[PDB]
Amino acid sequence: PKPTCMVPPMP
Amino acid sequence: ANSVLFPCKYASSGCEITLPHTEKADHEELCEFRPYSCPCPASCKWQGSLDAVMPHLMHQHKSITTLQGEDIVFLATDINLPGAVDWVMMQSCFGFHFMLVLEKQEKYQQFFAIVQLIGTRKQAENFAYRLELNGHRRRLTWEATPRSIHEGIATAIMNSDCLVFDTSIAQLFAENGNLGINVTISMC
Ligand SMILES: [Zn+2]
Ligand SMILES: [Zn+2]
């Protein structure tokens, strides 16, 4: 149940 | 021997080492008193001490999120998006902060995934990182020692000394236009 981070492309 | 000794470029910052003209250049590169550049993947040109790195990221790069855990999932969204882009986040484990970077570069597209430790070169030797792309009956794994932010990742990416893949590989592990990179940090 490892934590997931939705990373958006850098602005 | 018999040669004139010159002080280090960072003697003003606290370096108590004096070397001759020839040996001077080789040390100044590996010097502990050398200012740390911004670890964020060309827009920011900030420099300062290592103790000023975490506050700099908290203030000037508020959009970078930090996840707690030695084993996390870096889900980089819109990997098919037009142009060369960057994905960055931080990993908090073992009482240290790690910078996780996914770089998309224009190819004759290619991807570069690497982990940096917010700390010195000596501190990075005590760690190891694992990057894996997982799918059905498929897995691509990359394991190495994380680079210190003191030396950076510019030379590492150019030498492909990180997880390197193209558009063809990315589409095999992409789910709804997003690529999930499993990041595991370990103490060695
Ligand atoms: Zn020095
Ligand atoms: Zn910066």
* Chain A residue whose CA is closest to B102: A9
Which DSSP helix (H) or strand (E) runs through A4? strand A4-7
Residue B11, judged by CB atoms within 10 A of its CB (0-12, 13-18, 19+), counts as middle
Beta-carbon contacts of residue B55 (< 8 Å; ≥ 6 apart): none
- Number of other residues whose CB lies within 10 A of the CB of residue B46: 16
Find residue B66's DSSP bridge partners: B90
> To one decimal place, what's the resolution in Å?
2.3
Give the separation between CA B129 and CA B5, rounded to whole angstroms: 41
Is the Cβ–Cβ distance between B140 and B132 less than 8 Å?
Answer: yes
Give the separation between CA A9 and CA B84, rounded to whole angstroms: 10
Give the separation between CA B87 and CA B74, rounded to whole angstroms: 9
Compute the CA torsion angle B165, B122, B53, B75 (nearest 10 deg): 30
Give the separation between CA B82 and CA B181, rounded to whole angstroms: 20
Half-sphere exposure for B174 (CA within 13 Å, toward CB): 16
Task: Compare CB distances from A10 to B65, B88, B180 and report the shortest one's residue.
Answer: B88
Q: Which ligand is nearest to the CA of B8?
A: 1
Chain B CB contacts of A1 below 8 Å: none
Give the separation between CA B51 and CA B101, rounded to whole angstroms: 21
Of B140, B138, B141, B139, the C-alpha closest to B129 is B141
DSSP chain B: --SPEEE-TTTTTT---EEEHHHHHHHHHH-TTSPEEP--------EE-GGGHHHHHHHH-TT--EEESSEEEEEEE-TTSSS--EEEEEEEETTEEEEEEEEEE----EEEEEEEESS-HHHHTTEEEEEEEEETTEEEEEEEPPEETTT-SHHHHHTT-SEEEEHHHHHHHEETTEEEEEEEEEE-
Task: Compare CB distances from B73 to A3, A9, A10 and report the shortest one's residue.
Answer: A3
Chain B CB contacts of A2 below 8 Å: 69, 71-73, 182
Annotated binding residues of B for Zn(2+), written as ranges, equal: 8, 15, 27, 31, 38, 44, 56, 61
- Domains, chain B: 1-57 (3.30.40.10), 58-188 (2.60.210.10)
CB contact under 8 A, B75 and A2: no
Local structure of A10: helix, strand or coil: coil
Is the Cβ–Cβ distance between B102 and B153 less than 8 Å?
Answer: no
Q: How far is B73 from chain A (nearest CA, A)?
A: 4
**CA B19 to centroid of ligand 1, rounded, Å:** 9
CB contact under 8 A, B85 and A9: yes
* Chain A residue whose CA is closest to B82: A9
- CB interface of A with B, residues 1-11, below 8 Å: 2-11
Give the separation between CA B92 and CA B130, rounded to whole angstroms: 15
In eight-state DSSP terms, residue A8 is P
The residue type found at B86 is: D
* Chain B residue whose CA is closest to A7: B76
Give the separation between CA B18 and CA B90, rounded to whole angstroms: 37
For B25, list phi and psi in degrees, rounded to 5.
-65, -45
Give the separation between CA B122 and CA B54, rounded to whole angstroms: 19
